[PDB]
């Protein structure tokens, strides 16, 4: 499976920039953010067509949001940026388009990040 | 207590670039590399002080939790409160550590790691960027 990072201590206003290579045969990939594997403030699941976003609280999936698809290209290097406040997480897509996603679990920090095997993380930065 | 990363899958020849902020009160910091927390191919513990005598780079390994024979490299003048960068690569023989001034030193791959999957910083080194080149 993909890169896993803990003790991130990402605070409100701070920006998490993840650059990675989308598999040439990928039909989807996954980026999870939160406190741990069972507590996610953001399950980011683009599908090669829609973007599924959800939360997880104590292992229990929340209600999915679906955003309009982003034309991620297989075999290419793409970049996603995540910021958050008490109210919303903001997800910036490569084309500069943004959407918001509620901070339903009222997380005060993002400490956990994980990608799956369909998204090879090449670069993580905290801005 | 600092960022911890797993499933790195760093392979021979690949460069691991770690950029981070040295704590303003730091007299040293620690960056660990290996298979897991108990198995380290590199314990990178630079000790800097412009106003102290503890100036040296402590290097060691850890095998099943046990520290190996520690090596000491010449000190690097890391400045507290600054953002610094280190790049690490490896082959079967040695790990190569690239310091900010471009200076390199080597450290033996005594535990014969074929891949690095684990990295951890301490509370004195706040990682800002991790890159795989």
Swiss-Prot record, chain A:
SMART domains: Gal-bind_lectin (SM00908), GLECT (SM00276)
GO cellular component term, pick one: plasma membrane
UniProt keyword list: Acetylation, Apoptosis, Cytoplasm, Extracellular matrix, Lectin, Phosphoprotein, Secreted
SS bonds (residue pairs): none
Presence of the UniProt keyword Lipid metabolism in the record: no
Subcellular location: Secreted, Extracellular space, Extracellular matrix; Cytoplasm; Secreted
N6-acetyllysine modifications at: 11, 17, 27, 100, 120
Modified positions (N6-succinyllysine) in chain numbering: 100
Highest taxon listed in the record's lineage: Eukaryota
GO terms under biological process: apoptotic process; cell-cell adhesion; heterophilic cell-cell adhesion via plasma membrane cell adhesion molecules; myoblast differentiation; negative regulation of T-helper 17 cell lineage commitment; plasma cell differentiation; positive regulation of apoptotic process; positive regulation of inflammatory response
GO MF terms held by the record: carbohydrate binding; galactose binding; receptor ligand activity
SUPFAM superfamilies to which the protein is assigned, alphabetical: Concanavalin A-like lectins/glucanases
CDD domains reported for this sequence: GLECT (cd00070)
Entry binding sites for a beta-D-galactoside: 43-47, 54, 61-64
Occurrences of domain Galectin (ranges): 2-127
InterPro entries with a match to the protein in the record: ConA-like_dom_sf, Galectin-like, Galectin_CRD
Function: Lectin that binds beta-galactoside and a wide array of complex carbohydrates. Plays a role in regulating apoptosis, cell proliferation and cell differentiation. Inhibits CD45 protein phosphatase activity and therefore the dephosphorylation of Lyn kinase. Strong inducer of T-cell apoptosis. Plays a negative role in Th17 cell differentiation via activation of the receptor CD69.
Subunit structure, as described in the record: Homodimer. Binds LGALS3BP. Interacts with CD2, CD3, CD4, CD6, CD7, CD43, ALCAM and CD45. Interacts with laminin (via poly-N-acetyllactosamine). Interacts with SUSD2. Interacts with cargo receptor TMED10; the interaction mediates the translocation from the cytoplasm into the ERGIC (endoplasmic reticulum-Golgi intermediate compartment) and thereby secretion. Interacts with CD69.
PANTHER family: GALECTIN, GALECTIN-1
Protein name in UniProt: Galectin-1
Taxonomic source organism: Mus musculus (Mouse)
Lineage, highest ranks first: Eukaryota, Metazoa, Chordata, Craniata, Vertebrata
């Amino acid at each position: 499976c993909g890169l896993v990072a803990s003790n991130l201590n990402l605070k409100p206003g701070e920006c998490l920039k993840v650059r990675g290579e989308v598999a040439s045969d990928a039909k989807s990939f996954v980026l999870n953010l939160g406190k741990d594997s069972n507590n996610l403030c953001l399950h980011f699941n683009p599908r090669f067509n829609t973007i599924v976003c959800n939360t997880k609280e104590d292992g229990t999936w929340g209600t999915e949001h679906r955003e309009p698809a982003f034309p991620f290209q297989p075999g290419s290097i793409t970049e996603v940026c995540i910021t958050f406040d008490q109210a919303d997480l903001t997800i910036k897509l490569p084309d500069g388009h943004e959407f918001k996603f509620p901070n339903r679990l009222n997380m005060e920090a993002i400490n956990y990040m994980a990608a799956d095997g369909d998204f090879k993380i090449k670069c993580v930065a905290f801005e």
